[PDB]
Specification:
Elements lengths: L2 H12 L2 E6 L8 E3 L5 E2 L5 H10 L9 E2 L21 E2 H10 L3 H11 L6 H10 L25 E2 L1 H13 L5 H12 L8 H4 L5 E9 L3 E9 L5 E9 L11 H15 L1
């Protein structure tokens, strides 16, 4: 059988471009499909963003209270837009950025890195520190979701983002205490139930960060654990750019791609 044929059928059925990378292990081959093609990050960057903030700060920094205004609220900020009067701590912002894709939280964490481009250069530099020579973040939320197809701004590759997540959650890019916090936020994500999670059997653990954007973009980056505790990184990226800027993102495509991957990894 040929898994690439099955991914190609998904591309036909959903009128989509699909990208998949599951890094190889001692016991498994890599799964790679358009893995070196560029796809927009969309909100998937928020996972490594939180890692970047954890990397350069003591954990006491998570208690720092950040205040902001209604004018700082950006598409879409489910948590931040309810806490304009109270502010939110850096830890609360990390929680919101990962678990609710909170854009304002992400923009405030970018500002916490600081520097040119409101933190976007700093974020890209963090990825460069993890050996990622291809990915780049050029815009804050929500503009980073809206670049046209073929524009390299605000893109990654399935290969690149998977190897970033591999180092962050299953490697030693972060010390284990910081790694545990990133892992827990992704484990309690509220936005992913219809993406990779929907393709893996209930006895697999799934932690994830989604992304959605223009041109039918729909992404999910996950770490999964088999029922015996064997972990894999699963990066699935998609767009439906043939349908134009307002093409519908299709979560079902990611669920089905994940079902194909779960089939191989089971």
């Amino acid at each position: 059988g040929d898994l690439a044929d099955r991914f190609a059928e998904l591309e036909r059925r959903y009128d989509a471009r699909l990208g998949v990378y599951v890094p190889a292990t001692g016991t498994t081959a890599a799964i790679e499909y358009r893995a070196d093609e560029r796809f927009a990050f969309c909100s998937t960057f928020k996972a490594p963003l939180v890692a970047a903030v954890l990397h350069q700060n003591p954990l006491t920094h998570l208690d720092k209270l950040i205040t902001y205004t209604s004018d700082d609220i950006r598409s879409i900020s489910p948590v931040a837009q309810q806490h304009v009067q109270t502010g939110m701590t850096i830890g609360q912002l990390c929680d919101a950025a990962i678990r609710y894709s909170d854009s304002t939280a992400a923009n405030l964490l970018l500002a916490d890195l600081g520097g040119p481009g409101g933190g976007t250069a700093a974020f890209t530099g963090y990825l460069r520190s993890l050996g990622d020579t291809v990915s780049r973040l050029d815009a804050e939320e929500p503009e980073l979701n809206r670049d046209p197809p073929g524009d390299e701004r605000d893109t990654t590759t399935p290969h690149a983002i998977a190897l970033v997540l591999q180092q962050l959650v299953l490697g030693n890019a972060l010390p284990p205490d910081k790694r545990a916090l990133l892992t827990d936020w992704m484990a309690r994500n509220t936005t992913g139930a219809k993406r990779i999670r929907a393709g893996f059997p209930a006895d697999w653990k799934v932690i994830d960060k989604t992304g959605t954007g223009d041109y039918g973009r729909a992404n999910d980056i996950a770490v999964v654990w088999s029922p015996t505790g064997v972990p894999y990184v699963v990066a699935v990226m998609s767009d439906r750019a043939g349908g134009g800027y307002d093409a519908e993102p299709r979560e079902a495509l990611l669920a089905e791609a994940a079902t194909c991957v779960a089939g191989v990894l089971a």
